[PDB]
Amino acid sequence: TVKELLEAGVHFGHERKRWNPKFARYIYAERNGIHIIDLQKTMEELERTFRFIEDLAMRGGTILFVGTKKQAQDIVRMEAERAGMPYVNQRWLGGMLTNFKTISQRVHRLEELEALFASPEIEERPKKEQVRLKHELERLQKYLSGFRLLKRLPDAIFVVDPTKEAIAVREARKLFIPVIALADTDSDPDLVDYIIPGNDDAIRSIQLILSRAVDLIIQARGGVVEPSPSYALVQ
Amino acid sequence: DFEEKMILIRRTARMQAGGRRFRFGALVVVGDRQGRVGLGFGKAPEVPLAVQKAGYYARRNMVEVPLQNGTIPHEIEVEFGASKIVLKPAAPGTGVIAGAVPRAILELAGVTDILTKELGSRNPINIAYATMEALRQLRTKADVERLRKG
């Protein structure tokens, strides 16, 4: 719960083009053909955002951490593993929210097959099944890994790039689910309920923001877990 | 609790090699006559499934109607596609004066007396949608002054 001048790399935005005019309020100026995020407005929105987050956290709500960006993959996979929160890592399957029942059936089949590879019954029936069901588990664990933690619709979602993840965003809107996001200059601010106007590219910004966020979560529910071990993923 | 009436059932057709293939659309309105309505269009291989599904959708999508003594607070024109609906408030005892479609929708919203007209395209689907939209746009003096506080 500090930040301030400790933000390094965030104020860097996307290029001159590729931007969204609706984002103009959050820009300071254009340096070297690069929109630079407004220094103060970032913290301005940060307060309200993290306040919402703390409230939601201590109330017992769940947050779905979402990004595909491959910059944000290896971060989210742990940062969401910290606390209790579910995440979407590999890709966002259309209907995970709106079709959520049907998608949950796949989770039931997942723990179904994990249960199959538990019992003696792995060897029962020909290798035809043993080669298949193993790959079924393979992909089910590849996609639904962080999604398995959702027993019911989430009370909010967290998004790294809201333009990239804009489907998740869209049906979160559709279900009246509060949308938290880290927005860059290419993104529509209007769709985001609680905005974090920063660089969604560099691993530094993602690490900083999500780590601080989960820190706030566990801080709200108490226990004060140690500093996030995603810091070695700077690579 | 929830009263529901279908508007039009229709049978459509696609064309596959060696034949026509029939599907069924159903327009169902649901409402409590307490001022809450809903409208849905279900589509299924057979009529009952389409009707039931339509009911499901109509209960999904709802509209809160601000009734004043059984009638509407103020007049609205609404254009949905080429269809146009004109709703106008009326004194008690008038009864609902409307075509089949908006009659059903209004009656299930708990409207006693109203005056309407269908203009442009009369196509029942778009008229229904137009009506729902009209109801969705109505405001009360309360809401109005809620907006203009400043």
Place this chain on the structure above:
Amino acid sequence: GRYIGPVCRLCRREGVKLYLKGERCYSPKCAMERRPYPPGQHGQKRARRPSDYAVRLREKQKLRRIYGISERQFRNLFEEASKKKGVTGSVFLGLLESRLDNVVYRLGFAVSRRQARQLVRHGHITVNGRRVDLPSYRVRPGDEIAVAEKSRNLELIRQNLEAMKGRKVGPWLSLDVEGMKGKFLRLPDREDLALPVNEQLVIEFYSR
């Protein structure tokens, strides 16, 4: 006109028990009791979901056949009530209930409405002491509907009024049985009438 045909058949077509017969519609002979399905060859077959128009038509026909009035008189009354101040439905019902024949029936001088119409046409009824033979005569509040002094010795009126001893009369009517006279106190509210009729459907039927 005024019909003149099988009545309990209409009990059956309208699907509700109407009393056009006076007594025996109370007795379990009404045939609406023993054959509640509609009249004719196809009466017992499954009915198809009626059109909106069908429902309105049938409701208005119900309301009309209850009072045994021709469609012309009926229409005239409705339009008259429509031009009038006040709610059209209630005023319609009020105007229907103001008919002399209906009042005679209500007061229990007659067991059925048709019998009452005969009683009016044959001069057994007086209004304020003057004889009135028109069943369509509109009664006004304050009017005393009595029986003809010369008709008071008639067997039918004996039977009917002897039955009326102990029976209560509608709130807008008063009845003196001994003198065989009654007073029309006011016009009935919608609340007063027990009619198995949605009037708004009839309003909707002429609304077309």
Place this chain on the structure above:
Amino acid sequence: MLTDPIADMLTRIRNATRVYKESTDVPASRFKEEILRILAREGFIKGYERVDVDGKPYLRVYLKYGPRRQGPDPRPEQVIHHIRRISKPGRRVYVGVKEIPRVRRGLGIAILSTSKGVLTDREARKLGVGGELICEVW
């Protein structure tokens, strides 16, 4: 040039609000100013003020909207849903005092120009004067 300055202002305001502009400038005139007063009083705009764009006078109309909404399309409710010009150059609409309309059964307004000045429907009806029917806003 502009054929109808007032219709133009109304349109400027419409176009400005549909994109949710913070404010909008319109070329200044006393009449426009008089209209804007009514607008502000009736609560359709946050307010207006005289400014100078280049060396020429303008009116900044600060617009007004509802709260952010839920579901898809968070875009707030317009305070001005409908603003429409009635009397135009080339067809001019004058009403008597009994001919003064009632907008959305009172939920809207209509701006009249009268000899007693620029008034609303309620205002003129109360003052007992008719006039030129400038527009309807609700």
Place this chain on the structure above:
RNA sequence: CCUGGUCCACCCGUGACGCUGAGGCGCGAAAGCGUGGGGAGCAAACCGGAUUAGAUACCCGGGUAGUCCACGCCCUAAACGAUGCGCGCUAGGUCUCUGGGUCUCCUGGGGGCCGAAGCUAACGCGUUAAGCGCGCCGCCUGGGGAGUACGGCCGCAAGGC
């Protein structure tokens, strides 16, 4: 050589002198007409050779009007963005022609593309609007009969309105 339109920079001059535009007047592709000239290539008509069941066509060899020039007529068209003119307003991105500037870029005029809001029956349009508005002109009112008949005007005629 003669001559029309237009764009930018300066902020100099006049002080609403503006917009549209029924009639009128002028222009108006190709074909076609009149007079005179010209005539290489092409080429309606036409003359042949093929093909075909036939082939008054497609293919091949010829060929006249015409195409070309001058002057005078004709007034048509898928004369098309199938989108009247003028002005104001409403995100941007990108390519390009042409000015100006503190010349990565900014700013102005034109031609393209994708797209905000919005519009549209959809297709699509979207600061080059088919969006939001005002002014003024032209036009529409089911299909065939029929752009015919009649009348009038115009034209040498063909024929046009």
Place this chain on the structure above:
RNA sequence: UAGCGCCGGCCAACUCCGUGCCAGCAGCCGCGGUAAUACGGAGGGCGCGAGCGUUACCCGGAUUCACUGGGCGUAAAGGGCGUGUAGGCGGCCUGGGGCGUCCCAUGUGAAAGACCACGGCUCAACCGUGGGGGAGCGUGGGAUACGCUCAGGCUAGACG
């Protein structure tokens, strides 16, 4: 005294027989070529009833000549293009007049009819009495925001 029309959908009311793209029906969509709820008859039903149907004509629905209240990229519809006459339309500020516009008062707007109430024919139809209206135009008085006009000024349109 009880009759007349209808029962494929629009549109309230269905079965048997005869007929076999015939005879015929039909307002529109349509029905009839062997098992017709659509022709013809019968039973039955629906609707009106001293009437019920048909034809013609008028308004309606028809926002289908769109003032209220429509359109013209591809559905009918932008003139082949310009120049410009009459006409229509007109940026910002001040002042005068008060033609348009608005307000008050007053005259007129016959009766019958229309509306409302009470009343006479036993009811009603028919009729009597009373009340309430009212656009338009005339006269007198008043207001001046907008449009008009005259007088002055400005430079954001236009022109140089």
